[PDB]
Design a protein around this ligand. Structure first.
Ligand SMILES: COc1cc(NCc2cccnc2)c(C(N)=O)cc1[N+](=O)[O-]
Length: 294
């Protein structure tokens, strides 16, 4: 391109086409995301530009925001693999617990950092978690959602996964809190453990009902105010809560305990990233080297 050279198409993300590219001048290899539609609000430019300062070892660095030719390009540090591909590659044997624990610990540090800076992700999923050969894992796309209101779809009729969406979002709550990210990470934690998505909904109501069938239909006792949420319906079926030991076997009680706190219905009772880091589950955390085949 003007200063780059497409090495290939890394994919077709939630916002647009993503290319692995090499800077012709510096020689650095980066991920280039071309954002979708015919104006690009200046509000989004200032918002995104702010994220260039959000630097942490567990957050994918946003190197540049280029608004030229009236188009929007986001330049990110490049990592060779995402957690979704890695979990598929580890499907037969499963990701070893020490590595699951290291990944969860690093992700929580990343969230604690973003959340302490009043930045929410809002759309965490295995595909947005990038890993390298040194055992590091990083959150990609933090803050883009807010700087772009609602996602809906990618840019080429692609189906948005609802699997990691917190219940308050599904019940129509208009204001997101840091708690939505904890929920998504809890779903991801469970998926790494069992090797199966925790709530693989295929519609918004199927998503909600899958959650209800496992954690029990929420009520005013466990979630004060839930019955007044925008999309709550008194006609929701009432399902009994399932024993946690049946949800993520064979995770130990430290892990089940942390997961249950990351999955509390009430966003206000849900554990913060900071508090989660102090959970006994991380008492023996280490940083193993993964087996990446690139
Ligand atoms: C398409 O998604 C992405 C994937 C990425 N890497 C993981 C990867 C996956 C497949 C092949 N090669 C690398 C990166 C990045 N920052 O390195 C960015 C985006 N993105 O959305 O900006």
């Amino acid at each position: 391109m003007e200063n780059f050279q497409k090495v290939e198409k890394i994919g077709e993300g939630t916002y647009g086409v993503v290319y692995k590219a090499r800077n012709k001048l510096t020689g650095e290899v980066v991920a280039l995301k071309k954002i979708r539609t015919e104006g690009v609000p200046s509000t989004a430019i200032r918002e995104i530009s702010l994220l260039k300062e959000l630097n942490h070892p567990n957050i994918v660095k946003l190197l540049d925001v280029i608004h030229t030719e009236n188009k929007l390009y986001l330049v990110f540090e490049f990592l060779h693999q995402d957690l979704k591909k890695f979990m598929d590659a580890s499907a037969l044997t499963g990701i070893p617990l020490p590595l699951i624990k290291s990944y969860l610990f690093q992700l929580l540090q990343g969230l604690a950092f973003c959340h302490s800076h009043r930045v929410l992700h809002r759309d965490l999923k295995p595909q947005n978690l990038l890993i390298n050969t040194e055992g590091a894992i990083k959150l990609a796309d933090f803050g883009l959602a807010r700087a772009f209101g609602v996602p809906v779809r990618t840019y080429t009729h692609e189906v948005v996964t609802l699997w990691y969406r917190a219940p308050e979002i599904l019940l129509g709550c208009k204001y997101y809190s840091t708690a939505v990210d904890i929920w998504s990470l809890g779903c991801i934690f469970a998926e790494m453990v069992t090797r199966r998505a925790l709530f693989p909904g295929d519609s918004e109501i199927d998503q909600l009902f899958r959650i209800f069938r496992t954690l029990g239909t929420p009520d005013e006792v466990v979630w004060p105010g839930v019955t007044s949420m925008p999309d709550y319906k008194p006609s929701f079926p009432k399902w009994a809560r399932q024993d946690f030991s049946k949800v993520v076997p064979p995770l130990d009680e430290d892990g089940r305990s942390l997961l249950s706190q990351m999955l509390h219905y009430d966003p206000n009772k849900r554990i913060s990233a900071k508090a989660a880091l102090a959970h006994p589950f991380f008492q023996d955390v280490t940083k193993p080297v993964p087996h990446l085949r690139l």
